[PDB]
Design a protein around this ligand. Structure first.
Ligand SMILES: [Mg+2]
Ligand SMILES: [Zn+2]
Lengths: 304, 702, 78, 50, 236, 544, 35, 61
């Protein structure tokens, strides 16, 4: 078999419920990117921007798979550090040449994590011809999107030279964008009630446990959001979904309301008026259906 | 010519002109400067003799030959009555290094004369401005001749000896014969009854290397002017042609050539199989009978075949190297071909191997890809190897009525991951008096400077920062950075002399934003109208969302048919990208195609059948035609009908929004009239012209 | 074009009593010299003449003349 | 109309008045001492034949 | 499909003929022919300047010892440092009077100058394929570089086009006025004649005046009837 | 004036001010550069109506607007000064301008009195003047309300694109801000887009729908079986007032009747507020068309109603596109090779027939059997035969369109044809049929050396293909020689475009200068200077 | 398309392609007399 | 040869890239495990540009 295998998980559900789950997953499950990047030294043949844009999208979940939950709740961060020079043999850079650290985010502890050996067979950059007289080296560090760079965290970087880091960070800090940057861990769709996950399975860890952690996080968040959903029962301001009992008309203007009412017989779009009886909505029934769907999803995942 | 004017070569015909190359400029300047030098020496000696005695030669007149200023002016862009021979290289694209040195310029004629066909590219000409119809591009098979003086003399001697030896008794008619000229110099007069033989035997001997030169031109003019012309001089346009001899295509009577071709070069073919190919110049071409294609030749009867002297190569060899970047131009409207040639030279590429060394302006592509639906010329010239775009997934549909009038939709995650990312690099230069540079006083504009008075490496400069200390003595008089976007300092070079010279190279990466400009290889250009999130885009059954959405109507109203064929072939390649031997196999779709659409469809069908042997007829048809069902992400339901959907090589153009934006609140004035000054880099104001004034009066707003 | 007793081209001002500044704006390049030679005295009504002296053209809202009646203000007492 | 090539030139055997920008410019110029196109219309053809 | 293969054969390089990159080949040679051969022929001159008495007393100017050398740094160094990329050419000049004597040739020197160590001539040099110039016969090629540019004094890259010559190879016909025509042509010396000589001629024919069918020029030839001139030249 | 004696026109002297086109008057007096101005690339926006314009942040953060000091505004000015929001102050009594630098400025120098003003950052719904060059007519320069938008581009509604002759492939537009109170009132009334709705001469609306919207309109009128939920999904935010009288199924005609909320008649289009034509096409919804619905609504009440209809109908058309989609595919054009093969065979046969007939005539003339024709008559006969062949191709294409419509009623390309947007039998003939004769100055290309155009044909050739009759279609692909004639036509067109661009501007300026001073007087008459040009302005003494 | 009031139709004249906006600039007797 | 994910769909392609560029396996063998059209194109057509060594020092006086 291969180090990486592409797989699919398919489940059949009520169309509105499948859409609800898909949109919830895309809105709530956010894996941070390595967009806080500082180049400390660069005498290679590639400019800083190429290195930084490439490193921003390292697939890090296959390394930090033991800390998924806390990473998804943003109680824990991570960083990567690279320092590599030309060599006579193996004159290239793999993902095994990095060092990976986890950040507690409460005590600001920085701790090293284990590296799978399969990472030795990945490729990032190939050096030019080796010349002893001249130098050809790269050194850089990158933090995940939500991290705050202050003296407290900097004091823990005992593997670096703090003066160089301070200088280069002061150089680059102005172009780092301030908002949170993330990716979706895998691809999720639901064409006509057919909920499908396109995922990648690696040889060195069990994918089912990681999938279960993600699904549990999603289910908890979705139930919490459902419990706190309110529909204004006054007049329509054309900005939020609302219900007029005088006319008995519902103005649908958000996705959760759309999916819930469609689950109970409506056929609405995202900015539309409809004649719907609000007494037909039963939140507990919807929550029970969601829980059953999550159990079914986990069962489908188990049979890979 | 008095009685039949239209049958005599026109003054705008290429038959009566020759072309100057790089070395000829230098040769002419050397000639003129040497003559001026000798003239000045003579005048000085004469004046010295007139005033003084002994014929004394003054010094300071025999130490300045004047070649230095002549050459400097030449490179500056002045040459006799022309001012366009040389220019500063604009570093837009790699292919420009081919495009510009293969251009031919004409003195101020704008109509497309027939004599330009087959030797110049039909579609590569300026589309607007003062140069419209005045600059042409050589075809990939055309060349301009060179020859040395000694070679010239030897060739002329051999030709004259041949004439005087093999035709001793029939070269002194002078009353009813055909005059024979070499470079317009009359040397004999041939008996009319023997004209044909003389030409045929000549050409044969030309192809065997008898005269020591394979590019000699011989023309037989017979309408009623009755001349035989021989041309050997430099500056002539020449191409290879297939030989037809006595109604017989020689290529078809050389069985060994087919087996031996793979191991031979062009000169080997000329040496070992003469009479298969002949080098022909434009004047000889204009007076010959040439069959347009081998296929057309094979369909004629022998008597018909006997009327022809040459046969032509396929049409793809009649385009230039720039037009060879396009696909299937003969399946589209011609105006689109002109536009496509214009915008191909503005596509961002792997400009230079010295990106980190050269201190110059430039734009560089970041994660390049090599095109795989190409022509042979694009491969031999190395334009393909240096890349000018990326393969992206497109859909042809209307997206909520947003992508209208050439606007496009682009995906946010595609941009985030590096899709069609570029880097712009700029050069800055200043000269400073030594006292000002060493002057010891911190102004707010010096925040990026080091203790040595120079900007720090890897710092980002803003719109008010200085690059080097320049104080006039207690006032700051330094130049300032004046771009609306920041840039990183990549390199600094300093020269210390009576003055201080500082050169700085800066770089900035520029991910696509609203207003940036893109295009395809069929001239479908547009700007970014909306950046859409991945969750807002329609998707197919495999979960794929398009990177770019283009409105479909413009494909059919402008009749750019070859875009659809390009998408079909790119998908076919993606299904099966390798040979039976497992080697990477590009697909050949030349400009001036000549291959049927049905053959391409069959090739695509074979690729898909190799990929997945078990496909239904409907699925196979959908794959061949690149049609898919897409789903609305808001409701997860299919659209009414299937959508054209697939990959294509997409180009980014050098027109960026933040390079054009301008705004002024208040600023400097001109001294004489006391009105707002001009210049984007100097904070000038926009001009309110008199046509705008007309409009305001038409509104009645006094 | 036929406002006078004879047709007149669009390239010239022959029969119309166009002012000197109007002709100069049109592009005569000798109108001022000839006007000085003939001692011409002219009113200021054309759009070009109004633009030259920063006056409001007699177009649209500018076709009328505006006054202020202070009668009611002066009949009010503090 | 000029910039879109709206008007297409045609060949004719008899004197005609052309369309497009050039003819409008000629009309506004009002140049003298040039030939003019004169049209004769009748219901008796002998007068025209002479 | 044999014609397509033969066409492809022209586009690829031909090492046996010295063609390493077809698209720009003709330009390379064009410059190589000038710097290596034609410059020497133009400069190497030995000409009279003035004559006295009767072809026995004349001043003569001679130029010889023409040498051209390339720079000592690569074009990338020239770009970085801000220098220029020029070859250096030097030559020696002699001015001497000659008196023709029955005993043979008498030579009396007047002046002599040399440029052995001086920027006597600076000639911009063509970078060429692989950042390799025709003067330097090195053995290293920078990959993915095709050249075709110059670097000027201010370290700015320059590039040029080709131009159509003013002199035509066929006579020009023109209708001067109704039943009055002209036919103008030019004549130029062969390449091996220094300095080059030019002549421009015009033939005029007017139906009203057939006796004045005249060939003429400007201050270089007589105005004569072309038929009578042909009789004079050919004796027919 | 050095030109009195010499002939050089480069020296500077007194006359330089009135030398040529670069006069001082026409470069600095009737035109000039201005302070509060901007320019940028444009893009579309569906959140902006025809009455509005979107301004990028980098412009909002530089341009400034004026607040005059008087009894009504003094407290607001004091608050703005306290909040560090004032950028400039002007003392009118001393004619002095002061710039309030952040962290450094003068307090005692600011004593606000009536007639002074302050300048702050420009605010939303302030009017601004903007346009696209060249400014050929009135609608290229208009005043609109500012809305804050994202990016660095200026955003316009596609509803005004036609009136400015604008598209989104790199066009730029310019802005100016004028804040004198009289100018503000004039901008708010006279230059507002709602006031400009109806064209001055022919009276049709100058704003409307474009491109795929047209097809949407055509489709919306034809959809038949809809439940109330689907109707309301289409109507979106305009569905609040929809009245489902007693029905359960609805048609597109019902939607159109609701959109036209008025019971009016017009021969042809309308009867009691309902469309009675067979279909809705370009002439109903596009700008500058003679059957516009917005035009009828404006005639009935006022321009406000017309502008409202334009906004609402555009919104619903785009919602239809969002729900159902639209796109043309390659299969719509060429499902298989049957029809193209048939037409190609027809052309191959007919051209050979024509050549044989011509050869027979030439052979008869070459002998003593008939007197030859004139050159002109011979050319006319050959041209007639070739034109007949082209007309045969046209008829074949029309029959094919009809048959395809019968067999495949939902063909999107034929939908474009039916709705009246860019597709017709001639264009389809070019794609699938034949190209036909190429002409320069109304004639085929002239012969030049041996009585021929290219050496692919024998001397004195009589082959029509050798003089620009192209047999192939675009799907087949043109040959090299055919491509020559095609490019001849294309390049001649481009060159003529440049020359005409040069000449038309000169003529236009002369005419504008000549007619500039002709106005309507106070009695409805047309006068220039002191001369009466016409008794009744538009024959009616009513607005044109 | 259909015909309703064809005698009052208005014909559209609008170029499809327009030029992109401008950008800032940033004797040997060896010639014919040319009479 | 430099990005670690597909720009179109975001899938990980670093392992196949090592298998292709360093081990020099056949394109068919490499693609055996890659299904999406976009990823196959990226692996088949992406290159690392040709470049010279950087001239040092970067700041020179
Ligand atoms: Mg445009
Ligand atoms: Zn992919």
């Amino acid at each position: 078999q291969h180090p990486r295998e592409e797989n699919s998980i398919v489940v059949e559900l009520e169309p509105s419920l499948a859409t609800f789950i898909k949109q919830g997953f895309n809105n709530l499950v956010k894996w941070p990117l390595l967009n806080i990047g500082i180049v400390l030294s660069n005498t290679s043949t590639a400019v800083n921007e190429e290195w930084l844009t490439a490193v921003e999208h390292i697939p890090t979940m296959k390394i930090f798979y033991k800390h998924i939950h806390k990473i998804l709740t943003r109680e824990m961060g991570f960083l990567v550090y690279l320092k590599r020079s030309q060599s006579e043999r193996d004159n290239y850079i793999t993902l095994y040449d990095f060092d990976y650290y986890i950040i507690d985010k409460d005590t600001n502890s920085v701790t090293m994590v284990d590296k799978p050996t399969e990472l030795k067979e990945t490729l990032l950059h190939v050096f030019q011809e080796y010349r002893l007289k001249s130098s050809q080296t790269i050194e850089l560090i990158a933090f995940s999107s939500g991290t705050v760079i202050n003296e407290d965290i900097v004091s823990k970087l005992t593997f670096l030279d703090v003066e160089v880091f301070n200088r280069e960070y002061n150089n680059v800090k102005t172009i780092i964008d301030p908002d949170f940057v993330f990716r979706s861990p895998f691809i999720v769709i639901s064409p006509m009630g057919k909920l499908t996950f396109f995922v990648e399975v690696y040889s060195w860890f069990d994918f089912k446990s990681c999938f279960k952690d993600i699904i549990d996080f999603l289910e908890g968040a979705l139930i919490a959001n459902i419990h706190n959903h309110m529909i204004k029962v006054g007049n329509c301001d054309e900005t939020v979904s609302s219900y007029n009992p005088e006319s008995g008309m519902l103005f649908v203007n958000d996705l959760m309301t759309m999916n819930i009412v469609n689950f109970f017989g409506c056929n609405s779009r995202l900015e539309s008026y409809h004649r719907f009886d609000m007494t037909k909505v039963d939140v507990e029934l919807f929550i029970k259906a969601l829980s059953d769907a999550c159990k079914k999803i986990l069962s489908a995942s188990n049979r890979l | 010519c008095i009685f039949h004017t239209s049958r005599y070569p026109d003054r705008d015909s290429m038959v009566c002109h020759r072309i100057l190359t790089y070395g000829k400029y230098f040769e002419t300047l050397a000639h003129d400067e040497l003559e001026n030098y000798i003239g000045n020496i003579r005048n000085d000696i004469m004046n010295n003799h007139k005033n003084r005695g002994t014929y004394a030669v003054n010094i300071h007149v025999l130490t300045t030959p004047g070649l230095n200023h002549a050459f400097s002016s030449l490179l500056s862009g002045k040459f006799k009555k022309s001012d366009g021979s040389y220019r500063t290289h604009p570093h837009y694209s790699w292919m420009q290094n081919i495009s510009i040195p293969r251009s031919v310029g004409f003195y101020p004629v704008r109509k497309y004369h027939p004599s330009q066909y087959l030797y110049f590219c039909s579609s590569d000409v300026p589309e607007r401005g003062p140069q419209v119809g005045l600059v042409s591009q050589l075809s990939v098979l055309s060349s301009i001749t060179n020859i040395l003086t000694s070679e010239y003399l030897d060739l002329e001697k051999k030709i004259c000896e041949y004439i005087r030896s093999y035709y001793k008794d029939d070269i002194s008619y002078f009353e009813t014969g055909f005059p024979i000229t070499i470079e317009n110099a009359l040397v004999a007069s041939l008996n009319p009854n023997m004209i044909c033989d003389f030409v045929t035997d000549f050409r044969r001997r030309k192809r065997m290397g008898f005269f020591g030169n394979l590019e000699v031109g011989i023309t037989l003019v017979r309408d009623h002017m009755n001349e035989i012309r021989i041309n050997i001089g430099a500056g002539r346009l020449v191409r290879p042609f297939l030989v037809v001899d006595n109604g017989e295509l020689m290529m078809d009577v050389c069985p060994e050539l087919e087996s031996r071709l793979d191991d031979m070069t062009f000169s080997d073919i000329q040496k070992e199989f003469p009479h298969v190919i002949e080098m022909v110049d434009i004047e000889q071409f204009t007076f010959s009978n040439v069959c347009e294609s081998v296929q057309k030749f094979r369909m004629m009867s022998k008597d018909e075949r006997k009327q022809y002297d040459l046969c032509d190569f396929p049409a793809e060899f009649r385009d230039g190297y720039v037009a060879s970047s396009l696909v299937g131009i003969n399946h589209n409207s011609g105006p689109r071909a002109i536009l496509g040639c214009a915008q191909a030279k503005q596509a961002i590429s792997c400009l230079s191997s010295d990106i980190r060394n050269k201190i110059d302006n430039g734009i560089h592509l970041m994660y390049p890809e090599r095109p795989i639906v190409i022509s042979k010329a694009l491969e031999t010239s190395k334009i393909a190897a240096n890349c000018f775009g990326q393969h992206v997934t497109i859909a042809l549909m209307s997206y909520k009525g947003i992508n209208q009038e050439d606007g496009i939709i682009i995906k946010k995650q595609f941009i985030q991951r590096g899709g069609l990312d570029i880097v712009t690099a700029k050069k800055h230069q200043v000269e400073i008096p030594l006292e000002n540079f060493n002057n010891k006083e911190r102004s707010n504009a010096y925040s990026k400077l080091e203790s040595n008075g120079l900007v720090r490496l890897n710092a980002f400069l803003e719109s008010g920062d200085a690059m080097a200390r320049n104080i006039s003595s207690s006032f700051d008089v330094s130049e300032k950075y004046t771009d609306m976007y920041k840039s990183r300092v990549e390199r600094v070079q300093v020269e210390l002399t009576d003055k201080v010279k500082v050169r700085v190279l800066t770089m900035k990466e520029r991910r696509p934003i609203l207003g940036d400009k893109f295009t395809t290889r069929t001239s479908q250009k547009g700007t970014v109208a909306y950046v859409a999130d991945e969750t807002e885009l329609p998707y197919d059954e495999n979960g794929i969302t398009p990177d770019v959405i283009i409105n479909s109507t413009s494909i059919f109203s402008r009749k750019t048919i070859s875009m659809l064929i390009e998408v079909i072939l790119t998908a076919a390649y993606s299904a099966k990208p390798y040979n039976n031997k497992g080697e990477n196999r590009p697909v050949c779709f030349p400009s001036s195609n000549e291959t049927s659409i049905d053959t391409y469809m069959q090739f695509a069908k074979q690729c898909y059948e190799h990929s997945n042997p078990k496909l239904s007829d409907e699925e196979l048809s959908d794959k061949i035609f690149c049609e898919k069902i897409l789903y609305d992400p808001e409701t997860d339901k299919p659209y009414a009908s299937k959508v054209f959907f697939g990959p294509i090589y997409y180009l980014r153009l050098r027109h960026l929004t933040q390079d054009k934006a301008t705004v002024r609140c208040r600023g400097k004035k001109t001294k004489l009239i006391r009105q707002a000054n001009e210049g984007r880099k100097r904070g000038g104001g926009i001009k309110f012209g008199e046509m705008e004034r007309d409009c305001l009066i038409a509104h009645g707003a006094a | 074009l036929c406002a006078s007793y004879e047709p007149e081209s669009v390239n010239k001002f022959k029969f119309g009593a166009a002012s000197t500044l109007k002709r100069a704006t049109f592009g005569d390049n000798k109108a001022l010299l000839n006007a000085a030679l003939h001692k011409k005295s002219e009113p200021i009504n054309d759009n070009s003449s109004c633009h030259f002296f920063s006056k409001v053209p007699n177009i649209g809202t500018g076709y009328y003349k505006y006054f202020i009646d202070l009668g009611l203000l002066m009949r009010m007492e503090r | 109309q000029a910039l879109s090539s709206f008007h297409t030139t045609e060949k004719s055997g008899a004197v005609k008045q052309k369309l497009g920008f050039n003819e409008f410019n000629n009309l506004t110029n009002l140049s003298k001492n040039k030939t003019e196109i004169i049209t004769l219309v009748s219901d008796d053809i002998s007068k025209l034949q002479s | 499909e044999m014609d397509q293969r033969l066409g492809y054969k022209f586009l690829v390089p031909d090492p046996k003929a010295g063609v390493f990159y077809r698209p720009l080949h003709f330009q390379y040679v064009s410059y190589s022919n000038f710097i290596l051969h034609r410059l020497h022929e133009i400069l190497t001159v030995k000409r009279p300047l003035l004559s006295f008495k009767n072809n026995t007393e004349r001043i003569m100017i001679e130029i010889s010892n023409v040498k051209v050398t390339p720079p000592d740094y690569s074009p990338i160094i020239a770009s970085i440092k801000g220098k220029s990329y020029d070859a250096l050419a030097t030559f020696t000049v002699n001015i001497f009077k000659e008196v023709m004597t029955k005993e043979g040739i008498s030579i009396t020197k007047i002046s002599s100058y040399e440029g052995k160590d001086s920027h006597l001539i600076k000639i911009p040099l063509l970078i060429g394929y692989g950042n390799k110039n025709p003067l330097d016969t090195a053995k290293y090629l920078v990959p993915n570089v095709i050249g075709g540019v110059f670097i000027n004094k201010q370290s700015v890259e320059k590039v040029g086009i080709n131009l159509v010559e003013k002199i035509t190879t066929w006579p020009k016909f023109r209708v001067v006025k109704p039943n009055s025509f002209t036919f103008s042509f030019s004549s130029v010396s062969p390449p091996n004649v220094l300095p080059t000589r030019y002549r421009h001629y015009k033939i005029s024919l007017d139906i009203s005046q057939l006796e004045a069918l005249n060939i003429s020029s400007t201050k270089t030839f007589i105005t004569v009837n072309i038929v009578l001139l042909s009789q004079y030249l050919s004796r027919v | 004036d050095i030109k009195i004696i010499s002939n050089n026109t480069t020296s500077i002297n007194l006359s330089y001010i009135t030398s040529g086109k670069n006069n001082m008057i026409r470069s600095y007096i009737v035109a000039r550069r201005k302070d509060q101005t901007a320019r940028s690339v444009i893009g579309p926006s569906t959140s902006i109506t025809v009455n509005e314009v979107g301004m990028p942040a980098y412009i909002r953060n530089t341009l400034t607007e004026k607040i005059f000091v008087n009894a009504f505004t003094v407290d607001k000015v004091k608050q703005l000064l306290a909040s560090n929001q004032v950028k400039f102050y002007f003392n009118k009594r001393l004619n002095q301008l002061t710039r309030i630098r952040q962290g450094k400025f003068i307090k005692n120098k600011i004593h606000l009195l009536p007639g002074d003003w302050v300048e702050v950052a420009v605010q939303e719904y302030t009017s601004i003047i903007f346009g696209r060059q060249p400014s050929l007519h009135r609608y290229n320069v208009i005043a609109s309300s500012i809305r804050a938008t994202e990016g660095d581009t200026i955003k316009i509604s596609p509803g005004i694109a036609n009136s400015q002759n604008a598209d989104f492939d790199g066009d730029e537009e310019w802005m100016i801000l004028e804040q004198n109170p009289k100018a503000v009132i004039e901008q708010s009334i006279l230059m507002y887009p709602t006031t400009l709705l109806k064209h001055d001469i022919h009276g049709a609306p100058v704003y409307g729908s474009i491109q795929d919207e047209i097809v949407a309109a055509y489709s919306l009128f034809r959809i038949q079986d809809l439940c109330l939920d689907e109707v309301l999904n289409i109507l979106g935010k305009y569905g609040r007032e929809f009245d489902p009288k007693g029905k359960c199924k609805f048609s597109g005609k019902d939607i159109y009747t609701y959109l036209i909320g008025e019971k009016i008649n017009y021969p042809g289009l309308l009867k009691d507020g309902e469309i009675i034509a067979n279909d809705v096409d370009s002439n109903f919804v596009v700008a500058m068309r003679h059957l516009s619905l917005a035009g009828l609504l404006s005639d009935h009440k006022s321009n406000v109603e017309g502008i409202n209809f334009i906004i609402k109908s555009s919104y619903v058309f785009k919602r239809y596109l969002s729900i159902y989609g639209f796109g043309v595919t390659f299969k719509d054009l060429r499902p298989n090779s049957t029809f193209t093969n048939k037409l190609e065979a027809i052309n191959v046969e007919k051209i050979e027939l024509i050549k044989e007939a011509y050869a027979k005539y030439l052979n008869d003339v070459r002998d003593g059997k008939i007197v030859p024709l004139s050159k002109a008559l011979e050319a006319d006969y050959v041209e007639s035969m070739l034109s007949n062949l082209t007309n045969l191709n046209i008829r074949e294409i029309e029959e094919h369109m009809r048959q395809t419509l019968i067999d495949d009623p939902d063909n999107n390309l034929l939908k474009m044809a039916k709705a009246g947007y860019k597709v017709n039998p001639t264009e389809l003939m070019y794609i699938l049929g034949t190209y036909g004769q190429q002409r320069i100055d109304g004639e085929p290309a002239e012969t030049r050396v041996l009585g021929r155009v290219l050496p692919y044909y024998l001397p004195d050739s009589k082959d029509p293909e050798g003089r620009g009759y192209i047999l192939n279609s675009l799907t087949k692909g043109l040959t090299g020689s055919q491509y020559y004639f095609s490019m001849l036509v294309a390049r001649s067109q481009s060159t003529d475009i440049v020359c005409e661009t040069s000449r038309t501007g000169t003529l236009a300026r002369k005419i504008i200068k000549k007619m500039e001073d002709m106005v309507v007087d106070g009695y409805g008459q047309v006068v220039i200077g002191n001369t009466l040009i016409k008794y009744a302005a538009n024959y009616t003494k009513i607005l044109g | 398309t259909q015909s309703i009031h064809e005698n009052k139709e208005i014909t559209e004249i609008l170029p499809d392609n327009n030029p992109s906006p401008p950008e800032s600039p940033e004797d040997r007797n060896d010639e014919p007399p040319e009479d | 040869v430099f990005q670690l994910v597909c720009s179109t769909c975001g899938k990980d392609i670093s392992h196949e890239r090592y298998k292709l560029i360093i081990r020099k396996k056949s394109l068919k063998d490499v693609l055996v495990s890659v299904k999406n059209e976009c990823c196959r194109l990226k692996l088949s057509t992406q290159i690392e540009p040709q470049r010279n060594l950087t001239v040092q020092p970067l700041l020179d006086i």
